[PDB]
């Protein structure tokens, strides 16, 4: 199961300034980058284009590259709508793209915050606003719900283009999307709290735990998944124990791309 | 869907005040301002989304808006100018992409 | 000047048909208007195109327009004295209120009785 999301974070400083940036993401790789400097949308990976021609993809930019001026147009003349209720500085991001689940069947999906908070999505035929939203945005979806290019747009966009895109680069990026990248680790002690480093691993499914001969410590907090650049992942495992304790403990490492033979490192 | 405009003709001079009025029944939220000269498309001046609200448009020097209603629109020449000779369209609309226009209003400034 | 017309003016006898041009580079085009105005007179409608490959139809007019080349044309049938009057071609760029109209300056016709 590949979720594929379009990231957009868009920034209106006054009723001028603005900027918009999107990053795509297919589960934990980067496929697209698309700076506000850039005229055009730029792949991260050698099958970024996925199974789509030339033709098919500068089609599909040139929307986008509709897109991204008329939805700042659209934004700051919606502010002009709502105004005083509604004022700069805004922060508007977009959440869209689609999940792969196995047959033939997938989920599309459009999110909308704004200052933040989840306020609208796309679902069916129109936009819609979630459980929780101000009552004042009934008006801006009234306008957005008027335009019905846009709408057989998204539809278009949504049920048929996401999924084909996405089966097309599941296919061509099966590579790096299987790819196997084996954890390096290391010990180290704070003023005392144990840590154990694991760092280098892809995918990010590990396991890992301090132990004490072959039982398991149920102290052994783990902490968050932390990013490499180098699209690898970094986590480290702490455990408070009393000083003079230290003898006898190790750290066991089980990672998909090792294949069996786990990672074990005594203190 | 109708929209009125008074006066349908003006004389006025240069430094005087003008007042161009527009009246719509029909319940819209957005209202715009044009004029139109001779080798040139209608050009935007001012407009509104509601009440309380003017937005400045394409050519919004020497113009000021004014939106004390829902029916009423009204574009203020403060101190009017020869080059502001032209003929004046009003229009109303609602969401959607149609816009509604007045029947104009013919102004000429003299010196 | 996104919104270009063709011809400037023209001279036709009644009973001729012509064809107006309409050329325009405004992105992005939703529907494309063509007005009739008399002289002294206002705006009236004549048809709205909306289609990446639109055919309308009004009595004595019809109109194409192709969303692709930017290009849009009215046809008048058997031209009627009363159809002395400046034709404007007008591009909107959105399907709701948040778009913007962009104005030719306009086609001149003059029917000869």
């Known amino acids: 199961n590949y979720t594929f999301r379009c990231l957009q974070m868009s920034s209106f400083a006054n009723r001028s300034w603005s900027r918009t940036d999107s990053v795509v993401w297919l589960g934990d790789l980067q496929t697209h980058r698309w700076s506000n400097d850039s005229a055009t949308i730029s792949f991260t990976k050698p099958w970024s284009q996925g199974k789509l021609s030339n033709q098919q993809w500068e089609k599909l930019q040139h929307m986008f590259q509709v897109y991204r001026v008329s939805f700042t147009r659209d934004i700051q003349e919606l502010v002009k709508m709502m105004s005083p209720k509604e004022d700069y500085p805004i922060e508007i991001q977009l959440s869209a793209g689609c999940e792969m689940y196995p047959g033939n069947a997938s989920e599309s999906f459009l999110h909308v915050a704004f200052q933040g908070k989840y306020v609208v999505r796309f679902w069916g035929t129109s936009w819609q606003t979630v459980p929780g939203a101000p009552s004042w945005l009934d008006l801006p979806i009234k306008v957005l719900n008027a335009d019905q290019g846009t709408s057989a747009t998204v539809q278009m966009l949504l049920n048929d283009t996401c999924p084909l895109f996405v089966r097309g680069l599941l296919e061509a990026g099966k590579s790096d999307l299987e790819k196997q990248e084996k954890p390096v680790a290391w010990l180290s002690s704070v003023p005392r709290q144990l840590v154990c480093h694991v760092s280098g691993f892809y995918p990010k499914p590990v396991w890992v735990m301090w132990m004490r001969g072959d039982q398991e410590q149920q102290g052994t907090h783990r902490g968050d998944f932390l990013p490499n650049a180098d699209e690898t992942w970094y986590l480290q495992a702490t455990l408070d124990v009393e000083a003079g304790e230290e003898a006898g403990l190790a750290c066991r490492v089980k990672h998909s791309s090792l294949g069996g033979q786990d990672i074990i490192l005594y203190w | 869907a109708a929209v009125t405009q008074s006066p349908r003709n003006k004389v006025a001079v240069t430094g005087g005040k003008v007042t161009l009025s527009c009246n719509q029944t029909?319940?819209?939220?957005?209202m715009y301002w044009y004029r139109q000269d001779t080798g040139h498309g209608l050009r935007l001046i001012h407009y509104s989304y509601g009440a309380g609200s003017t937005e400045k448009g394409d050519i919004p020097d020497g113009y000021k808006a004014s939106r004390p209603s829902q029916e009423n629109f009204s574009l203020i020449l403060e101190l009017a100018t020869p080059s502001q000779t032209s003929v004046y369209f009003c229009?109303?609309?609602?969401?959607?992409?149609?816009?509604?226009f007045g029947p104009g209003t013919r102004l000429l400034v003299l010196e | 000047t996104q919104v270009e017309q063709s011809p400037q003016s023209l001279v036709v006898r009644q009973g001729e048909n012509c064809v107006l041009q309409c050329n325009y580079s405004v992105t992005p085009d939703n529907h494309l208007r063509w007005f009739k105005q008399d002289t002294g007179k206002g705006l009236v409608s004549l048809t709205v195109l909306v289609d990446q490959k639109d055919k309308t139809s009004n009595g004595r007019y019809s109109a194409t327009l192709d969303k692709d080349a930017k290009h849009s044309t009215l046809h008048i049938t058997a031209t009627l004295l009363d159809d002395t009057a400046t034709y404007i071609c007008?591009?909107?760029?959105?399907?709701?209120?948040?778009?913007?109209?962009?104005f030719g300056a306009g086609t001149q016709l003059i029917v000869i009785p």
């Open positions: 007008v591009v909107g760029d959105r399907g709701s209120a948040l778009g913007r109209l962009h």
């Open positions: 029909n319940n819209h939220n957005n």
């Open positions: 229009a109303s609309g609602d969401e959607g992409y149609t816009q509604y």
